[PDB]
Symmetry: C2
Subunit: 209 residues, 2 copies
């Protein structure tokens, strides 16, 4: 069966649920102000109560000072001493990804239209090769539209699935956990959709140059 149809890039061994905050919308040429990652091995994914997070999870959450003000705030990030999106941050990201079993796939809500192009732009500014260049990515809006076979905001999906209000809405810290919960609704089905739709992060076009 499936003689001509195969996964594009094999089974993904790590899913990295990703959310970010930024100074504004694309035409403003925005900068990332917060980045939150939750890295889960596929085995941790191999009304309904809200699933508890897997016991083995790697997490990274960083606040990042932008060069220009938001439409978080630049001034408050600066009085908390936050540093820019820089080479040391790339070292950190590279070392964090290196601890994950490969292939690794980012999962971000609206990542295809926002988070992934923005991250591509931020990483392009740095001297060192992008640490995401061997990683894959998918957009969880597409995933949940496929699985629910309607708003596709993160909070609306969570309430539609779990019939209770989400926690800490519209913050990267809270929303990345909400994203994980939504992806644990049908975890085997989610993994299969991710395997089938993962694409190389290197093919993501920068938001701006």
């Amino acid at each position: 069966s499936m003689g001509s149809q195969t996964l594009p890039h094999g089974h993904m061994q790590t899913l990295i649920f990703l959310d970010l905050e930024a100074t504004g919308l694309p035409s403003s040429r925005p900068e990332v102000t917060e980045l939150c990652l939750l890295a889960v091995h596929r085995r941790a994914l191999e009304p309904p109560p809200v699933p508890r997070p897997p016991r083995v999870v790697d997490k990274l959450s960083l606040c990042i000072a932008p060069g220009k003000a938001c439409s978080l705030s630049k001034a408050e990030l600066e009085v908390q001493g936050r540093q820019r999106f820089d080479d040391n941050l790339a070292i950190l990201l590279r070392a964090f990804l290196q601890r994950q079993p490969q292939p690794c796939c980012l999962v971000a809500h609206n990542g295809d239209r926002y988070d992934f192009p923005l991250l591509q732009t931020e990483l392009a500014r740095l001297s060192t090769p992008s640490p995401l260049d061997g990683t894959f990515c998918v957009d969880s809006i597409a995933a949940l539209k496929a699985l629910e076979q309607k708003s596709y905001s993160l909070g609306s999906i969570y309430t539609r699935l779990y019939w209770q209000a989400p926690t800490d809405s519209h913050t990267a810290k809270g929303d990345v956990l909400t994203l994980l919960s939504i992806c644990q609704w049908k975890p085997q089905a989610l993994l299969q959709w991710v395997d089938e739709h993962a694409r190389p992060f290197s093919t993501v076009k920068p938001m701006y140059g």
Copy 2:
């Protein structure tokens, strides 16, 4: 005068490990919450008896890593968490290695300095064990310029000023009249530790400033 100046970042730290010290344990999970001094200082003043549990600051950096040990956990060491050696290996975790030190260093370098680790029983357990893990590596210590303090002594001082078990949960329940969430896990307890340290953040910061010592002076748990 202050031994090492005013601390600009507090890094609340907890870890899971394979057993008690005589078992020559290894770290299986490391959880850090880095908070700038100003973020702690801006915490809403505790008022009322009990005061509300403080909300975590809006700006916190977080790192949480699971680590495969070389040896199995002791009986009952992974009960509450489920972080056995077999499970960490099933989920692809790597050992405590040079790349992990590089990761920790880059995380620390994003924090304003001077930076001070804060861990409950850190002087007798977390800090010596981390020193041992780092001593095996080929990198410099990533904690070479970082300070540390134990929050048991800190909260003993702060509760005596406002006035008895000093386990993390006992302190938190005494302060907030609520049971801590996800008790007796590094992931849960590091947040409980932050909440206790937000009770009286000005007095806590003053105590930390006066008692901070270099992590490099911490003696290894074992060699």
